């Protein structure tokens, strides 16, 4: 059960880190013509 | 009017015919 707990925690942390870093990667919203 | 029910039903028939005639005459008069 503890192994499952650690595995699930690692999976969730990995996916949330991917989410956060991905949104940090996206270029800021800018207007090319203005 | 052999029965009160038949008398009432015939009265209703004539009343509805009167209503239809009235609406027909109204549309006729208001047409022109």
């Amino acid at each position: 059960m503890l192994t499952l707990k650690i595995f699930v925690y690692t999976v969730v942390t990995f996916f949330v880190c991917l989410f956060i870093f991905g949104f940090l990667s996206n270029d800021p919203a800018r207007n090319p013509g203005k | 009017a052999v029965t009160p029910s038949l008398k009432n039903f015939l009265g209703s028939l004539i009343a509805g015919a009167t209503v239809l005639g009235g609406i027909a005459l109204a549309i006729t008069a208001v047409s022109k």
């Binding site: 699930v8 996916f15 991917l18 | -």
Partner: protein, 301 residues
């Protein structure tokens, strides 16, 4: 992110995929897939669950003498209440299944998935260069899902009160909810019924009017209804189509959220009385008699 020359970042945000993943999809796809797999598995085969800690193992698995209509994923045991019950807390997998843990797993993963689904809707609204309010419209069914799966357990203090993930389970949840909170008489659910009926009404009218107009509209509707149509321009008509069902469902979800915290529907029992004080029955107290039947039969004890 930034994996192998940012190839992973390029692929996640790539719009050439048949289904746009997106950074919100990075959380939706695993969450929704986990919820889907666990729901399918539990529906197909799962031991009976004590929906209440009275030790009455309600069964909702197909293999346990159920059909699609009757089959359901039983809510979590009332003994667990609002406690977090993942697999690693139960003494064994059998105990986890016996207390209805799959229901919390599915509900949590599915709620996260639908939230990230609103997120993906925004992401592809922004990527394709259009106005991002399809997520706002989708917030209505998501709001109702949260109300029935998360807010109602929170208010009632137990996940056993959440809607079972089934059809007959859904009907039982609705019957119980009417018994305990008089859902029909609450103005917010009344407004939600108005929203759904008007949504169907306007869907039918819009379909018929556009189908008839597409010979290759405004005058027909104007002569039909005596007040004519204010939404002469198609943009306003389509905003009205968006707004009516959306806010109706927002308000029914909010009504359910309020009843979660024990704010029931209108109670007009004994509203009208005789001169001597004798209670004169109305439709309200016949609804009350029905509610009494549902309430007494619910309390299996």
């Amino acid at each position: 992110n930034s994996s192998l020359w940012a190839r992973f970042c390029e692929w996640i945000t790539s719009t050439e995929n048949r289904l746009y993943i997106g950074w919100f999809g990075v959380i939706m796809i695993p969450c929704l897939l986990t919820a889907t797999s666990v729901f399918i598995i539990a529906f197909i085969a799962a031991p009976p669950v004590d929906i209440d800690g009275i030790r009455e193992p309600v069964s909702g698995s197909l293999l346990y003498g159920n059909n699609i209509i009757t089959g359901a994923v039983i809510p979590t045991s009332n003994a667990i209440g609002l406690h977090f019950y993942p697999i690693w807390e139960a003494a064994s997998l059998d105990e986890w299944l016996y207390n209805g843990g799959p229901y919390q797993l599915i509900v949590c993963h599915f709620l996260l998935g639908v939230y990230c689904y609103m997120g993906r809707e925004w992401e592809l609204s922004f990527r394709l260069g259009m106005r991002p309010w399809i997520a706002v419209a989708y917030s209505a069914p998501v709001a109702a899902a949260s109300a029935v799966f998360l807010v109602y357990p929170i208010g009632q203090g137990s996940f056993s009160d959440g809607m079972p993930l089934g059809i007959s389970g859904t009907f039982n949840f609705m019957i119980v909810f009417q018994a305990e909170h008089n859902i029909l008489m609450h103005p917010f659910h009344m407004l939600g019924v108005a929203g759904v009926f008007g949504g169907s009404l306007f869907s039918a009218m819009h379909g018929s009017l556009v189908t008839s107009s597409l010979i290759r509209a405004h005058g027909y509707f104007g002569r039909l209804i005596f007040q004519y149509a204010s939404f002469n321009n198609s943009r306003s008509l389509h905003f009205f189509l968006a707004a009516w069902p959306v806010i109706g469902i927002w308000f029914t979800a909010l009504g359910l959220s309020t009843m979660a915290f024990n704010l029931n529907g209108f109670n007009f029992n004994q509203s009208v009385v005789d001169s001597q004080g004798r209670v004169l029955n109305t439709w309200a107290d016949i609804i009350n008699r029905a509610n009494l039947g549902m309430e007494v039969m619910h309390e299996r004890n």
